[PDB]
Amino acid sequence: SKLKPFFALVRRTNPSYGKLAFALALSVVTTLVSLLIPLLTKQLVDGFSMSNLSGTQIGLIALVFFVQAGLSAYATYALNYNGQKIISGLRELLWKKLIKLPVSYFDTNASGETVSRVTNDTMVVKELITTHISGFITGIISVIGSLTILFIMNWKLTLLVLVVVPLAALILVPIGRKMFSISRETQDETARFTGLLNQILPEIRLVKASNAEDVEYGRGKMGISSLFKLGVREAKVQSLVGPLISLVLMAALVAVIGYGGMQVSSGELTAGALVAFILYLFQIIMPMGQITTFFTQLQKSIGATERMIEILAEEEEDTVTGKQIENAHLPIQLDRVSFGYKPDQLILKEVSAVIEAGKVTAIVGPSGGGKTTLFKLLERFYSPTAGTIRLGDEPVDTYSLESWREHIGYVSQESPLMSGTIRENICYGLERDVTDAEIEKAAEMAYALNFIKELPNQFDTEVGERGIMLSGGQRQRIAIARALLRNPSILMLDAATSSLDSQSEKSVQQALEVLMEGRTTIVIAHRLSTVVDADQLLFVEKGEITGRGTHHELMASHGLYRDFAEQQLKMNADLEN
Amino acid sequence: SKLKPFFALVRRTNPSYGKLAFALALSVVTTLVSLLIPLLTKQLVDGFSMSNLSGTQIGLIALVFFVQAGLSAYATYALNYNGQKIISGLRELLWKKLIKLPVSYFDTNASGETVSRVTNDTMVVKELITTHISGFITGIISVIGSLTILFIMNWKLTLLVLVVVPLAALILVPIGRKMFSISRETQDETARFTGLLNQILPEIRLVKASNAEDVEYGRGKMGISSLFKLGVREAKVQSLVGPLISLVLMAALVAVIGYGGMQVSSGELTAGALVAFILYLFQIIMPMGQITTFFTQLQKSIGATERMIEILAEEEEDTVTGKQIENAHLPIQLDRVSFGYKPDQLILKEVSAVIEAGKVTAIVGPSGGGKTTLFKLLERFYSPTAGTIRLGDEPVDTYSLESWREHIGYVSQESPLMSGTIRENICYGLERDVTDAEIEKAAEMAYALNFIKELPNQFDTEVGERGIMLSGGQRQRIAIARALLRNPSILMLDAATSSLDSQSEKSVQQALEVLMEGRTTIVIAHRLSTVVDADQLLFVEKGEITGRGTHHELMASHGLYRDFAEQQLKMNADLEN
Ligand SMILES: Nc1ncnc2c1ncn2[C@@H]1O[C@H](COP(=O)(O)OP(=O)(O)OP(=O)(O)O)[C@@H](O)[C@H]1O
Ligand SMILES: Nc1ncnc2c1ncn2[C@@H]1O[C@H](COP(=O)(O)OP(=O)(O)OP(=O)(O)O)[C@@H](O)[C@H]1O
Ligand SMILES: [Mg+2]
Ligand SMILES: [Mg+2]
C-alpha cells in the first residue's frame, strides 16, 4: 500500500517521458545485443579472418562502438535529466504547498524541520530514478531472456529455478521492511538536525552571550552521532543484500544437483547440457543483484518520502469564495467570539466588541491577556471556535481572504524583516511598480527617511538575516513603513511604538494621525500615554474585555486597573518632582 | 593544488583505517582472483569431470562462493561504515568550528547558508568515499595487471597503448575542470535555497499578513530552477565521460592497426597473438571507465568542499589567555573608544565614560544612536578600533573571555528564545544542576512565576520556534529570568522593559532593584520614566555622549534634548488633564 501513493506522487509532477522511454528503449536494445553475443562468439573466429581479408571493416566496427556506448551515454543523460525533472518538480510542488498551509500548521509543526523536506528529502529520491531504474529495466529483461534461454535447453530444471526465485523474494521482503523503517528514521533525524542547527545559529549572540559554546556543541554532536548510528545501521542492512542472494544460488545449485540425482541417472550422457545449464546459472546472478539493489533502493526512497507524501494533503484555502470587500469602510462587529490555540484551553472567552469605522480604538491590557491573538483572530489567520466576526451584519467568512487581506495593514509585535534591500522589505508583496515617490512618502510617514539616507540609500542597504543589520528602532520604523505603504483601509499596530524613542514616537504618531484620519486604525499600547486621544478603549484582561469606552469615562468607571493608569501617572510624577 | 587540502581534511578527522585497509585488501584479492580466472577457464573442463567423479566437492565450491561474495559484502560494509565515519567526523569538526567564530563572521556571512554548509555538503562528499574509491582501487590494479598481461605477449604494442593512456588523461583534465566549476556552483546554490527558504518560513505570519504567497512562491521557483541549471548541466558533462573514453580506445585500435602496418608484414604468421591482444584490449575498457568515474566524482567532491575548507580557518578565540576575573565589582572605565561595524563608517565616535561599580547608570538616547552596539562593545563581541575598555586601570583584553562572560548577564533587544522547555531557556548554558527552588526564585524575580503556572508548569511548556508559543511580554520576562538566574556581577538590560505592561514593569523593577542593590546594573530606557532613580545617565546621540551625570543636573544642564524628557512630561500631562 506504500507503492501507490509514491508513484502517484511521481505521476503528480511532469516527468520527461520523451527522454525516459527513449533511455528505456536504448537499455532494451543494449541488453538484447548482450543476449545475442553468445551466438556471435562462435562467429568471431571466422569474422576475424573475413576482416583481415577485407580490411576496412574494423573501422566500421569502431563506428559501431562509437555508436553504442555513445548512444548508451545518451541513455545516461536521458535518465539523469529526467531525474532532475522529477525532484525539481517535487520542490516546485512541495514549496507551492508549504506557503499555503494555514498558520495553525506552523504553530503545531516547527518550520525549521519542514525546510529539510523541500531540500533534503527530495534529493534522496535521486538514486532510485538516476541509476536504479536503469538497473531494474536491464536486469528484469536479462533474467527473463536468460530464463527462456535456460528453458529451451531444459524444462524441469528451469521450473526448479523458477521456484527458487520467489524464495529470494520472500527472503528479500523483511530486508525491505527494515530498510523502510531505517530510511524513515534517517530522513526524520536529518530534519531535526537541520533544525537544532538552524534554530541555534541565528541566535549566536545568545550562545556567545551566555557561555554555551560547550553545551550547544553538545546538542550538535548528539545529532551528528544519531545520523551516524541511523546511517551505519542502514549500511549494515545493505550488507545483508550480498550474501543472502548467494544463498538462493546455493539453494538452486543444490536443487539442480538433487534433480541431477535422477538427472545423472538419465543423463550421464547429457552432462554437457548440465555444464551449459550451470554456466548460464552462473551468468544469471548479476542481474539478480541489480534487481535486489533496485528493490532496496526503492524501499529506502519510499521510507524517505513517507513523511513528505502527507505534507501534500493539508487543505490550503486562499481564494475559494472570491467575494470582494468592495468598499471596506464598515464597522467591524464581534459576536460572542471565543478562541484558543489548543482546543482544550480558551484564550478568548466570549469576547464581544464593535470597532467603529473611522475612529481609533486601542486595545490596552496586561501582558498575556489576549491582544495579539485577538488581532490574529481579526485577520482570520484563525477561525474562532464560537460565533464569528461580521462587517455590518455580514459575516467575514463570505469574503475572500485575498481581497480582504489586501485591505488591512499589520505591524506585528516582532517587527519582522527579511534579507534583501530596505526597498524590498518596504515593497514586500506588492504587485505594482512601487516606483520611488510612493516609498519616499511612506518612509517619510514612518519617520524612516531621515535615517535611511545616512546609510547608502535604500537599495545598497542589506538588512541581513532577520533584520540584524539595522537597529531595534529602525526595523520597527521599517515595519511601520511597510504597513503604511500599501494604504490600508484598516491599520493594525500590534505595539508599533514599542522600541522607539520618545521623539520618534511623537513624529510617527503625528504623521499617522495625519494620514489615517478617515479610516480605521486599531493600535495596542502597552503604556497608556499614546492612546489618550483614542476614540475608544478596550481593556483586555485574561481574554475578557473588562472595560470599554472613551478613556475618561473608562478611567472614571473602571475599578482596580484605573490604578494601572495611575501608576503611569506616578511614573511620570516623580519626573515632575 | 586542490587535492592536498582536501586530503588533509579527510586526514584531519579520524577515519576507520582498520576497516578501510581491510576492504582494500579484499578488493585486491578479489581482483587477483578475477585476473587468475582466464588461467583456470581451461582447467574447468576437466575439473567438471573430476567433480562428477568425486562428488561432494561442488558443495565445497558453494562454500567458496559463500565465502567470496559474503567476504565481498563485508568489503562494502567496511567501506560504507568508513564513509559514515568521515562525514560524521566532518560535521563533528565543522560544527565545532561554527559556534566558535566571532560574531563579526555572522554579521558578514548569513548563517542560514552556513547551516547547509554542514548538512548539504558533507553528504555530497559521501559518494567519492562509499563506492567510487573502490573503483580506483579495483581499476588501478586491473589495468596494471592486464597491462603486464599484454606486455608478456607483446612489447611495442604494449608501449603503444601505454602511450595512449596519457592521451585519455589530457582529454580527461578539462572535464575535471568543468566538473569542479559546476559542483562549486551547485553547493553554493543549494545553500542559498536552504537559506532563502528557511529565512522565509519562520516569517509565515508576514507572508500571510501581506499577500505575498504568489511572490514568494515565485522566488522559490527561481531557486528550484537554478538548482536544475547546476544539475542538468553537470549531468551533461558526465555524459561526456562515456564516449570520450571510447575515443581513446578508437585511437589505440587504430594505433594497433597503425603498427599492424609492419606487424602484419612480420606477423601474418602471428595473427592469433594479435587476436588475443585485441581481445584483452577489449577487456581493459571497463576498469578505465571505473577510473574515469572516480576522477569525475573526485573533482565533484573537491568542488563541493572548496567552500567548506575555508570555514575551518577563521580564528576562534575563546579562552586563550586564561586570566580569571576576580573582584568584578570594579568600575568599568572607557578610554577614547571608537568602533564601527564596517571599518569605513564609525558608529562610536571617541566615546568615553565611567560606569561606577554598584550604581545604576542608564544609557538614554534617540534611536540609531549607538546604545546596543555600545553594549556589544562592553561584552567584547567586538574589539574597539580605538583605545580599549579597562577595569580599574587594567585593560579588559587580559582577562579570559570565558571567565568574564560568566559574570555579565545580558538581556538583548529581541529577547531571543530557542525551542525547548521554559526550564531549558531559563537554565540555558549553565553547568550546575540548577535546582527548582532556584529557578522558582529567578522567575519570581522576573515576574514570570505568576504566569507560567497557568500554563502546564515549566517542563511541559514548549516555546516553539523562536519563542512563538509565548507572548511578546512573556518571552521578555523569560529573558529577564535568564539574566537574573545566574546571579551576575554586572547586569545589562538592552531595553528589558520594552514590551511589558505598566504593572509588570513596576513589579520587575521593584524585584530587580531589591536583588541588585550591591552590584552594577546598566539599563537602556527608550522612555525616561523608569530611570529617573538611576544614579547616572549617559545621553548617547549619533555615537557621541552629549550628556552625562545625574538626571536632575543633566536635565538642568542639557540643551535641546531636555525637551526629549519634557515631551514625555506632556505625554503624561494630557493624561492628567
Ligand atoms: N501558538 C501560539 N501563539 C501565540 N500565543 C499563544 C500560542 N499558544 C498559546 N498562546 C497563548 O496566547 C497568549 C499570548 O497571546 P496574547 O494576545 O495574550 O499576547 P499579548 O496580549 O499581545 O501579550 P503582550 O500584550 O504582553 O504582548 C499567551 O497566554 C500564550 O500562552
Ligand atoms: N551588523 C550590525 N549590527 C547592528 N548594528 C549595525 C550593524 N551594522 C551597522 N549597524 C548600525 O548600528 C546602529 C544600530 O546600533 P545601535 O546601538 O544604534 O542601536 P540602538 O541605539 O540600540 O537603537 P535603539 O536604541 O533604537 O534600539 C545602526 O545605526 C546601524 O546602522
Ligand atoms: Mg537597539
Ligand atoms: Mg503580544
Contacts of A342 (CB under 8 A, 6+ apart): none
Which residues, in sequence order, are CB contacts of A472 under 8 Å at separation 6+? A499, B367, B372, B413, B414, B494, B495
Q: Find all residues with CB under 8 Å of A284, minimum gap 6, and list them.
A: A142, A143, A146, A147, A150, A161
Q: How far away, in angstroms, is B340 Cα from ligand 2 center? A: 10
Residue B39 near residue B335, CB atoms below 8 Å:
no
Instruction: Concatenate the DSSP letters of all residues of B328-376 into one string.
Output: --SPEEE-SEEE-SSTTS-SEEEE--EE-TTSEEEEE--TTSSSHHHHH
Lookup: cell for B124:
555530497
Residues B319-328 as b or e (16 or more Cβ within 10 Å = b): eeeeeebeeb
Q: Considering CB atoms only, which of B81, B232, B243 is closest to A70?
A: B243
- A-chain residue closest to B250, CA distance: A62
Instruction: Please identify, by atom number, the ligand 2 atom nearest to the C-alpha of residue B345.
Output: 9
Q: What is the DSSP string of B417-431?
A: --SSBHHHHHHTT--
Residue nearest to atom 25 of ligand 2 (CA): B367
Shortest CB distance from A572 goes to which of B98, B196, B572?
A: B572
C-alpha cell at A191: 530534519
Instruction: Give the dihedral sign, CA A506/A510/A515/A518.
Output: positive
Name residue, grid cell 553528504.
Answer: B123
Candidates B529, B540, B569: best to mutate against A (most CBs of A within 10 A) is B529
Gap between the Cα atoms of A202 and A200, Å rounded: 6
Q: Is A184 in contact with A304 (CB distance < 8 Å)? A: yes
Q: At what angle do helices A57-98 and A3-12 cross, to 10 degrees?
A: 100
Q: What phi and psi values does residue A118 have, to the nearest 5 degrees?
A: -65, -40
In three-state form (DSSP H/G/I as H, E/B as E, the rest C), the secondary structure along A379-404 is: CCCCCCCCCCEEECCCEHHHECHHHH
What residue of A is the nearest CA neighbor of B75?
A: A239
Distances in Å between the Cα of A126 and the Cα atoms of A83, A121, A301, A386, B117 are 6, 10, 9, 48, 20
Asked if B224 contacts A427 with a C-beta cutoff of 8 angstroms, the reply is no
Q: CA-nearest residue of chain B to A470?
A: B368
Q: Is the CB of A395 within 6 Å of ligand 2?
A: no
Nearest Cβ partner of A99 from B119, B216, B574?
B216
Rounded to whole angstroms, the Cα distance separating A518 from A512 reads: 11
Rounded CA-CA distance A149/B361 in Å is: 94
Task: Tell me which residue has cell 589495468.
Answer: B143
Q: How far is CA B287 from CA A123, B140, B141, in A?
A: 29, 7, 9
Strand, coil or helix: what is A195?
helix
- Rounded to a whole number of angstroms, the distance between the first and last alpha carbons of chain A is 79
Q: What is the resolution of this structure in A?
A: 3.5
Contact A481, A472 (CB under 8 A): no
Residues 6+ apart with CB under 8 A from A141: A27, A28, A31, A32
Q: If you write DSSP's letter for every residue of A86-108 in order, what string do you get?
A: HHHHHHHHHHHHHTTS-HHHHHH
How many angstroms separate the CA atoms of A352 and A394, rounded? 16
- How many helical (H) and strand (E) elements, i.e. helices and strands, does chain A have? 23, 11
CB contact set of B264 (below 8 Å; sequence gap of 6+): A52, B271
Which runs of consecutive H residues, i.e. helices, occur in B99-119?
Answer: 103-108, 111-119
- What Å distances lie between residue A379 and A491, A576, B209, CA to CA? 11, 42, 8
Whether A231 and B200 lie within 8 Å, measured CB to CB:
no
Supply φ then ψ for residue B553, to 5 degrees. -70, -25
Phi, psi of B309 (to 5 degrees): -65, -15
Assess whether the C-beta atom of A105 lies below 6 angstroms from ligand 1.
no
Indicate whether residue B413 lines ligand 2 (CB < 6 A): yes
The gap from C-alpha A361 to its chain's centroid, in whole angstroms, comes to 39
In this structure, the number of other CB atoms found within 10 A of the CB of residue A510 comes to 12
How many residues are recorded in chain A?
A: 577
CA end-to-end span of chain B: 79
- Considering only the beta carbons, identify the residue of A118, A465, A502 that sits closest to B111: A465
Beta-carbon contacts of residue B25 (< 8 Å; ≥ 6 apart): none
- Tell me whether residues B239 and A74 touch, CB distance under 8 A: yes
Total residue length of chain B: 577
Q: CB within 8 A of B360, min separation 6: which ones? A: B513, B521, B522, B523, B531, B533, B534, B535, B536
Residue of B239, B372, B494, B546 best to disrupt the A interface, most CBs of A under 10 A? B239
Per DSSP, what are the bridge partners of residue A390? Answer: A333, A395
Of B286, B243, B235, B229, nearest to A19 (Cα)? Answer: B235
- Is B521 close to ligand 2, i.e. is its CB under 6 Å away? no
Distance from the Cα of B247 to chain A's closest Cα (Å) equals: 7
Q: From A297, A236, A237, select the one nearest B19 (Cα to Cα).
A: A236
Whether the CB-CB separation of A87 and A122 falls below 8 Å is answered with yes
Q: What are B494's three cell numbers? A: 538592552
Q: Which of B414, B415, B469, B471 to mutate to test the pocket of ligand 1 (most atoms within 8 A of CB)?
A: B471
User: How far, in Å, CA of A106 to CA of A309, rounded?
Assistant: 17
In chain A, what are the domain boundaries?
1-319, 320-577
Residue A360 CB: number of other CB atoms within 10 A? Answer: 21
CB B447 within 8 A of CB B496: no
- Sole residue written with cell 541565528: A202
List the grid coordinates of B312.
Answer: 575551518
Closest approach atom of ligand 2 to CA A455: 31
For A261, residues 6+ apart whose C-beta sits below 8 A from its C-beta are none
Q: How far apart are CA A410 and CA A428, in angstroms?
A: 13
Q: Are B236 and A77 in contact (CB under 8 A)?
A: yes
SS3 call for B527: coil
Q: Considering only CB atoms, which chain A residues are within 8 Å of B216?
A: 99
Interchain CB distance below 8 Å, A205 and B474: no
- Count of CB atoms situated within 10 Å of the CB of B218: 10
Provide the CB-side half-sphere exposure for B375 (13 A, CA): 26
Ligand 1 atom at minimum distance from B451 CA = 29
Residue A286 near residue B69 (C-beta atoms within 8 A): no
Write b or e for each residue in B541-574: b if 16 or more Cβ atoms lie within 10 A of its Cβ, otherwise e.
bebebbbbbebeebbeebeebeebbeebeebbee
Question: How far is the alpha carbon of B70 from chain A, nearest alpha carbon, in Å?
Answer: 5
Q: Cα(B529) to centroid of ligand 1, in Å?
A: 26
| Minimum-distance CB partner of B471 among A77, A372, A568 | A372
Cell of B132: 567510487
- Asked if B472 contacts A495 with a C-beta cutoff of 8 angstroms, the reply is yes
Q: Are residues B211 and B188 in contact, defined by beta-carbon separation less than 8 angstroms?
A: no
> What whole-number distance in Å separates Cα of residue A142 and Cα of residue A138?
6
What pairs with residue A348 in β-bridges?
Answer: A339
| Ligand 1 atom closest to A540 (CA) | 21
